[PDB]
């Protein structure tokens, strides 16, 4: 839902980040159901950011990730804090 | 090899003698988990160097498990 | 669908030959990756239509004493896809020496073509 901006029931607009300015730069209506500048003067590519969100969503479904987590828990803090 | 098998009997993992310790094995190279995906499927070879290898009999077992099990399913 | 059936079929397969070739070459009928599917199919049809019939004919010609038999194989190239001639015809007819292709061939390709 973050990738598709289906956020009306999860996000309000009172916060200090300016969503109207963000969506105006992107040419988008807002919450559904030139260099673009986002937070802190970072240049934002929406398609790359949406691909990154899709990557994490599938990354969290891999059965290999649970095995990675199990093995990574055992790595000593002396070599990886 | 007796230390590999003892470790598995004691803790369920050939690499560790204890369930609540995760110190790396020193008697030989670590034994990887079997991950059932192409490119993975690692095994321990019981030779003198005890190496880790991937995809045992991949071609031959594809013949039996894919082609032959489909001939018998028709 | 038609690419997979037409390639290995049309008096070239019953329902069993298609399944055997599908297994042997890892051909996925219901994929959408035209790239990978074409690569696998091209490997499948090159053997069926080109390479193995050549080896069968050389074997028959040598086994039945029809004449002297000599076989070559030109390994895969990436260099001259703009030319429609394949590697064996380009070398056998000496295209590295053509004035129209000056600057496009190395001295090693000229030396190989001359041999
Ligand atoms: C968001 O930005 C626009 C233009 O920069 C501005 O007009 C608007 O007041 C801002 N929203 C706020 C400050 O809540």
UniProtKB/TrEMBL annotation, chain C:
<comment type="subunit">
    <text>Monomer. Homodimer (via ChEL region); occurs in the endoplasmic reticulum and is required for export to the Golgi apparatus. Homooligomer; disulfide-linked; stored in this form in the thyroid follicle lumen.</text>
</comment>
<protein>
    <recommendedName>
        <fullName>Thyroglobulin</fullName>
    </recommendedName>
</protein>
<comment type="similarity">
    <text>Belongs to the type-B carboxylesterase/lipase family.</text>
</comment>
């Amino acid at each position: 839902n973050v990738g598709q901006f289906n956020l009306s029931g999860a996000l309000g607009t009172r916060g200090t980040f300016n969503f109207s300015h963000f969506f105006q730069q992107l040419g988008l209506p807002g919450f559904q159901d030139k260099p673009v500048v986002g937070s802190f003067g970072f240049e934002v590519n929406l398609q790359e950011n949406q691909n990154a969100l899709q990557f994490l969503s599938s990354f969290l479904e891999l059965p290999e990730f649970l095995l990675f987590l199990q093995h990574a828990i055992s790595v000593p803090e002396d070599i990886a804090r | 090899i007796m230390q590999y098998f003892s470790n598995f009997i004691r803790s369920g993992n050939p690499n560790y003698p204890h369930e609540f310790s995760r110190r790396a094995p020193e008697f030989a190279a670590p034994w990887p988990d079997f991950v059932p995906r192409d490119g993975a499927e690692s095994y321990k070879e019981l030779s003198v160097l005890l190496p880790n290898r991937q995809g045992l009999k991949k071609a031959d077992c594809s013949f039996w498990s894919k082609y032959i099990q489909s001939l018998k399913a028709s | 669908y038609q690419a997979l059936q037409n390639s290995l079929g049309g008096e070239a397969a019953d329902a069993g030959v298609q399944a055997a070739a599908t297994w042997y070459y890892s051909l996925e009928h219901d994929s959408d990756d035209x790239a990978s599917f074409s690569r696998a199919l091209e490997q499948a049809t090159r053997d069926y239509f080109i390479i193995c019939p050549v080896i069968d004919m050389a074997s028959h010609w040598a086994r039945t004493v029809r004449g002297n038999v000599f076989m070559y194989h030109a390994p895969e190239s990436y260099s001259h896809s703009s030319l429609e001639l394949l590697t064996d015809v380009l070398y056998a007819f000496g295209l590295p020496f053509y004035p129209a292709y000056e600057g496009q061939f190395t001295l090693e390709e000229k030396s190989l073509s001359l041999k």
